[model samples]
Target chain A: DRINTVRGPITISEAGFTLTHEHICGSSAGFLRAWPEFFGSRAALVEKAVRGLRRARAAGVRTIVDVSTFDIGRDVSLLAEVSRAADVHIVAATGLWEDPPLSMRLRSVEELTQFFLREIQYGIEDTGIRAGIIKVATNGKATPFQELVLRAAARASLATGVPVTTHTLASQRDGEQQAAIFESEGLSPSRVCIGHSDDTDDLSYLTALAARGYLIGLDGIPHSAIGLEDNASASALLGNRSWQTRALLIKALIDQGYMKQILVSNDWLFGFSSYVTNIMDVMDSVNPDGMAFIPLRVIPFLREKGVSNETLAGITVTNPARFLSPTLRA
Target chain B: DRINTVRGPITISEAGFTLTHEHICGSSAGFLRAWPEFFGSRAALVEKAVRGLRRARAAGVRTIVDVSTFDIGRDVSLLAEVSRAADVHIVAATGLWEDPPLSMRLRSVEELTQFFLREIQYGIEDTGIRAGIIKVATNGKATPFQELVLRAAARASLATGVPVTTHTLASQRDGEQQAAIFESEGLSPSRVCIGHSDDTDDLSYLTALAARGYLIGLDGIPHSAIGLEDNASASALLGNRSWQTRALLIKALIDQGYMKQILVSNDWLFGFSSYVTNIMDVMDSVNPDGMAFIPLRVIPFLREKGVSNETLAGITVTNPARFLSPTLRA
Candidate 1:
């Protein structure tokens, strides 16, 4: 069995033009629990998400993996509504953000694994919207708490056969550590997607991760929602070539015969409240093409750069579908 | 109502002349599991530990906190034997090392808390030897896994009243992050000891942690076991004033009226079996005095350098006792 789209489980073949790492909304679970009003009410956020999804669908995006986890206020019910309204397939995730909620921080891996497995086997918060993929993350260094989430996510993946994706700081080689833990937990590297590899131009590092048999996420094409305070200055100082650098890195990965292992996305969160919403406000000036840049801009750019159409399709379409497909032996 | 020793509960007063942090035997749980003989058989390691403890006792060290958690072969039974032979009080810890054992990494904080509490309440692995302190650690950056251990250590401390001590990269302000997490978990900074503050010469950082009512462990005064690769060159470049700088920092903190928030130790692991053993071999040529560096050398050095006897007593005696005394509320 395969899972994607809140509408229902779909065959892997049905998951076309998939954006393997993107989010409709993202907010700290603490904020949502304390003050939902901070997010400007549910209806407003949902409307924005719906519009974003519609724009994405219009740009030829068919399926999107919403990588927000519990710590990030992953609203599966809201995701379902946006999917229904926008007519785009939405795959919600179950795991944790880099800094987990206090409640999650207090949980054991067995407890967390059970929770993740429940989300995959059953559904998230009575929404009957099952999580198709598990997301785990790490920052500069792999801390013990991150290891717990990564290992627990791996266990849940092995038990329920859900595909795993990750958020990693590329410079820190977090993907290598995440892959090691997942591989140790009996999940093949093929069952995992290593996100945020485009953040650095270190080819050796990116290629090293790719060689590990894991799907390398040349995601974060424009900029991550966080870490943009200095982006405008850094980009301007460096001649506004940040996006080009990402494209070239992806080009390098594709050229290195790791095309099948490459997965690319904008890592753009459409309705994420907090610093991320501020990102949306500045989207035009900062990431002008916005989420549409990948489908409309990046793909076209890649084609112009002499990356064959078949190779682009493999990264944008086929690899994501194969990654989303269930790989549990049971 | 007090915490445990090798034999049983000791009055907080009996925990005198205490070195806040030290280790008897340190090896990975994996190495110990694969080949217990890697540590030169249990009895031999225990004998070496006893000799070291006896030497420390002769140097006026009564109670020594064994901060080696489960990952680093925290053998409570062996600790008991060493305490019995050496006649020095030993307070074994229950929590985690910097890198947790795989089994521990896969556990939730709640699960880890329960395990730590069990070690304190019942005993460690049927030994009837309760742990008196909870230990946790972070490297240059606190990863999610390390945060889980920190939060778990805090939860265990809250539940069991054991004082929490931590291993931290002093330069990274890891202690500050740890205190925040513990304070958020409803633990007072007074109930916590932010260790390894001696590694850096940053007086502001040291004072800030002390001001927060945390016991600043000017531990690692003579050496940090793991990072010796560049020590000789680094020290030579700085004219071997590293140890002098640590002493001066302690003197500065003492003069600044943060004496109550100070705890001092060598962070000496008696039987750590690794490249660390090679460190033991060249101690006479390198560190010369070894674990005795604190008692036989640093203290005398501090006293001679205008650190008053009253302040020395406060750091070596009064502060550690107060930190170790039960802080759990009914």
Candidate 2:
């Protein structure tokens, strides 16, 4: 079986110009868990997502994996509505976000694996929508809690043949640790996409990760997936440079012949709520193009830097298809 | 007319085995601003710093540039006490932290320059303790506000004769931008210590920075200066691998023959308040030798990898002295 999309299973060849990791309606965990009514009605939220998706689709984005996990308000029912309206092949994910939900926290590794597997095989809740990808997150350093989620996600990926994507701190070179854990769990490296890798310009660290056969998620194009700390941490001193640095890193990685293993996305929050929305608004003002940033600005910028159209398509389309396609059968 | 230290100005030869950037007593800005009583008494904080400094002294560290900026509870008076107690030459820094205080925000670059220059000349807040360096910070990217501070720091350095040290997001390669700004402000690249350069494993970036004639601060030795985000942001997924990556990058830079341009430090925080203390304690448990990490572990580790003793001494000792010496006759 190939990738399971909202439209039905699609072959790798049909997965045109897919964005590997993104969120249509990402929300803060605390807000979603407490006062979700404060964001907007479900209909309004779904409509907002549809509008954003339509913009992306018009610009050549055909498919996207919505990676909002339970803690960050994963709404499969709402996503189906947006996908239908936008006519985009949306691949939903079955995994936890960085913050563990109470249900997730209470569960064992085996229990968490079964939970993810159920969503993949039996569909999420009663919607008959199967998740095409497994999502897992680890902070800069994988705390015990994060490692548990990563392990459970790896197990689910191995069992259901779904590809796993991650949100990572690339600067920490934690991709190595993530890859090691996935390997220990017997999940093939090719079935994994180590996400947010463009945050750092460390070619050696990146090459090391790619050498292990995992797809590199240069997903934070034109902006970092990790923004400045809300308060002053050491990172506050640096501000956000990944937007520019990400492009430079992508070019460097492509030159190193790892184009086949690179995936690109904006990781945009099209319909986020509360303080999250304010932050996105600020980012939008800074980068007015938003989701279209890649095809509109980044691609052209990269082209000016001498990146070929074929290489661009390969990273945006072909690589994602290959990564999302089932690998265990091989 | 010369670089000042706790022990008074001496010849460049006296700046032996200096750790270019570190914190003797670091405190959280918000908590310190809100609750001064929460952290232990001033004497206790001084005692803790002295203990850590003495340990570093035994490991051959002779001088340290305490880079805690004003907003981060930079206690010039306390540092003087610790320096005397530990019998170590402490070169204090004067500048703003990443999050500029209200006073800093209201001031112009010229005013900020005067403030910093005053500390370098007359001493800090009637403490009679002159600052030996001007410290400034930038996150991944240099925002307009950060650029303002950087330019002001450069102007101060040009006026006061003391060198400038920076807190950087190395993965962003912000050092290049910093160097560009400083060069534009008529400050020599050799007069700037680009701290946290070891955060990335990109030899190309590091080499480019070194080639620009700036001192590269490999300040985060056994522990990385940048930690991962708490939740799985892109970085969290990757996990922490920068400790080893930093060591490897250091060796690579040495191999590239830029040892004289490299300066090493632990970026250690000896006495910090709040949850910050817990993080350091855990790090200490893992690295019991603490500040001794450089001379004890990193040196031996690099030597085992074939880095020469002369190269090691150059990075730890000679480069720092050159960087810390007065750069202007004013």
Candidate 3:
């Protein structure tokens, strides 16, 4: 296999490595606004922990950022258990989510600023409860909610000096909105990674964000080898072998000398779908480990499709490592 | 006495007028979120209104729009009476605010789409009142809430052929955000007037908005006009005289050849303050009619300060009239 442990902010000097976007521990069910079938109680939570970590372990996944943010259902003790047992280094999250929580009045920006700073500092200073990369989110439209979260994250980034990653929506306008917020907050563009770019289905927006010094994530790409329905556009974009979107994005970053601003990871989960379906296609046949094998399994396929080794290496290894390194990070 | 009037979507011609973004009547207290500030009770309601109406007329105001969004306390009967007694053309709002309003949540895009159509059709429609223009709003930052409002308004605009204006924060970032929302909702840049440009305090931002085929409201001037806060910067970039700020804004519109895309008004409130305040400076006498007469007096002052008569006419008279005209006004 290739690299299963993609340490989010880890600075590795090599070519291929694992990613940190997937949930190896727990997830926030808040967005399932409609008291849905999958969310509620702690049932889904336990399933995610058991299946996700075991699969990553079997798949040889070495590291990942279980970036389910605080107050958005972050359980560090549980994640710690999963990490120790699975032998994967897990970085927790420290930031805010966009959208007023389905309930409790969202915290004010100033309050959120303090919360994020405390998390980042506490994680770094205490118990090796490390937050490898800062995490923030924006609902798809780059609404004021996202701006509020971004403002806090920026303050925390300035304070703790950690690389920042945002869970963003999939639209060019949303992309531009994030860039505007970043510029307004005085953030170093290079240290920020705009996630979910794969969902936007627009090269212009991705290129524009990258051009502005922010790293762009192609996390949904390599993971699409086995499916199309789940990742939708990501699978559609990659399945179509339309590297133009990915290439245009990467080339722009490289051209802008923003080679260090491009990072790749598998935003996949062996536990997100049906356990039986996952076991059949994801674990039993693919590898002993579950979703962790995803990045490795797909890289060869992407290589065959003409994603140059150097470019692939940069995305999978160098860029991501640099992104995680404090030296070049926020 | 200045051109004091109740706040609304209507505009006056070269004779000089006042408008500082306002909702002549009051808003709905129906939703839990609106809470106490969402004036809904009758005695309290009428009293709240009589004060505003009497204040405006007493201040020698000519007209106003009661931008009480549909679900958020749109009292048309109250507006009609206030307008008749006050003898000012009282405009009433019928469009929706962003998502937080229950109407947006309970209604479909189609149902929400019908809201403005129904409102602009009769002013109070189904009720036979005359609405001056459509009043739609985003949640300051363009989120899905904004997108939903824009889509509904654009549909309504295309149907009833009414012009639409929006409320915004005082940041150029607001301009970019609001414009992006409008663009996504399929609105031509010319069709949307991004409100609250004064808060941004940046000339380039105002210039950019105008260049994008959008109108800029210099309505909120007399306050610390954002970028103009530093007189030196204002003078260097905008010109001389504090009135130069208005002239410079209009001049920029002319420079960008977007004279057709400019409209000016006071988000006015005549008697709210002895001297007038735009919400923030509630009791401050720095402004003539506070928010109300600023539009009326400021435009005239700009004219005297050598702001070209042509551009001055556009800012004060022609443009706003066009916005209020029931057709696809040029």
Candidate 4:
């Protein structure tokens, strides 16, 4: 079966060199509407996003997984426009982020599951764009509010057979906990991608989750791409430990026979929405290559580390294609 | 005009020995909804709150402001039960905490303002229990989403005459940022209380806000009351410093003749929500005296340090009464 994308569906194999976990501009969240001036004009931002996406496209990236949800202000319309402009397949997300709204916290898991189901089944709003993946997120462990959201995502994925991706505080080992909730819901481990798995260099932890058939997202290479410091910006544990250490961990994971489940991509922020300007300047500098960081920087480094071209292709192209493919469907 | 209480209205002067900032069980948030078992039983938790409030009552506390919003799971009905059982005047709050949900983050400030206005003008969810104060909060400096909430809170206060109180990340000195948003919306400095001011010993910061006729909250002595550390549970900025040092800051603020605008209270958590249970024991132990920590413990220390009984009363009683006074109206 074909997979969902912002523009339209495409054969699963068409999603070439996909960046598995990234954001187009959903970090803009509410500011895009609440304070439109903060983002300037929609046209300008779309063009800026087009340029960024085109930058990645230049490096042989054909698709990008924008894992931002409604809480993160998933503008499916904007995603559709940007995809057309950049000529890239963008997989929009369906599940909520860590900061669920008051109503979401109050809502029952079953009721919340229906919202995700509606998006995946019928398409978002009236744009007729379906969410290709369920984007579940957690900050530290699974708080009751976040647990409710995780459960809802699991149930939604089970009902529709859509793949689930996640945002995790890699330091807290949140991925296993997220996987725990998903598996208990009787959802297949293969259907869930444990994201930000690269944030921790714990080979045992990464291998263990991957052995369960969960896709391992080594998605924080961008932090290595731009040299930002601290957990907030670094996106990884052990003070990010630097990109070289993370690259070796990737090689080790592939060496550990989990290459089939390994995903390498830059979890880059294409647009920043908040008034915190220093985020763009001093810290959180955009990944210089956008989605192309893994292909251009990480892959070359892995090559120098004596990794083969076939293995590199497996991580960058083959792994994401297999993970995003419609293996379990209603 | 009278102030609103969980049970009903009370003449402003009857709000004696008030603890201006506290939460009875709103911290329970969604755990009380999603997994009520995690909290044991509502009745047991209600009884626990009653015991805590009664402990404070025994220490001469009469009024307590529960500054939790819908995001924090404000339960007016539960507050009514706890207030009546403990024989405490519980002033319920309108407005929101720092983490607004998707609809709130997306809604116009005018739309958000109406929700607060409806809660204050009519009552919370048909309980006929009107909110006594506007409880607005922010994590760091104001994000655009938080700024919208602040503006709505300001608008609600300007219309309904309800006083505004806030939760601030004290190290960030977020109160002044909160006050800046409030004043810009024409909210009087007198009607707004800057909570968790004791979190920082920065005397100049506290004095400047107070000098502008804003009530300064030294509401974090309980973190000092407990020995737990870190910004997550400490509630204060400086490794929490010590309760004695915070008490000294309170004494100095009074000595600076800002006693009229100084409010002393415990932002104690009556219930620990979420599955994070090490919280109940290790880090976030409930203050033993509950609301009485300021009076039974800190007041005695302040007295030994030569703070007059009259002065103490002004902090615990007079300051709160004046701060909660219905002086702001449309």
Q: Which candidate is the best by DockQ?
A: 4
Cα lDDT, all candidates: 0.74, 0.73, 0.53, 0.75
DockQ scores of all models, one per candidate: 0.02, 0.01, 0.01, 0.05
The single-chain TM-score for chain B of candidate 2 is 0.90
Q: Could you say which candidate leads in TM-score?
A: 4
For candidate 4, what is the TM-score?
Answer: 0.56
Q: Quote each prediction's TM-score.
A: 0.50, 0.48, 0.41, 0.56
lDDT of 3 by residue, B219-261 (tens): 5455443333444422332223354454357555666677776
C-alpha positional error of residue B88 in candidate 2 after TM-score superposition, expressed in Å: 74
| B178-297: candidate 1 lDDT, tens digit per residue | 888888788878888888888777778878888878888888777632334666633432233367677677888878988888888877765554332334454434565555677888
> Candidate 4, residues B162-267: lDDT per residue as tens digits?
7888888887889889888888999998888888887887877888798888888888786653454343633432254677887788888878988778878777
How far residue B165's Cα lies from its native spot in candidate 4, in Å, is 1.0
Better of 1 and 4 by DockQ: 4
Once model 1 is optimally superposed onto the true structure by TM-score, how far is the C-alpha of residue B40 displaced, in angstroms?
46
Off by over 4 Å in 3: A1-16, A25-60, A99-106, A123-130, A222-259, A270-290, A307-311, A327-330, B1-330
Note the residue pairs that clash in candidate 4.
Answer: A101-B101
TM-score for the B chain of model 1: 0.90
Q: After superposition, how far is residue A253 of candidate 2 from its true place, in Å?
A: 1.0
* Per-residue alpha-carbon lDDT of candidate 3 for residues A131-181, written as tens digits (9 for 90 to 100): 656777766665565677787777777776667787766654465777777
Chain B TM-score for the candidates in order: 0.90, 0.90, 0.70, 0.92
Off by over 4 Å in 1: A30-37, A224-241, A274-277, B1-330
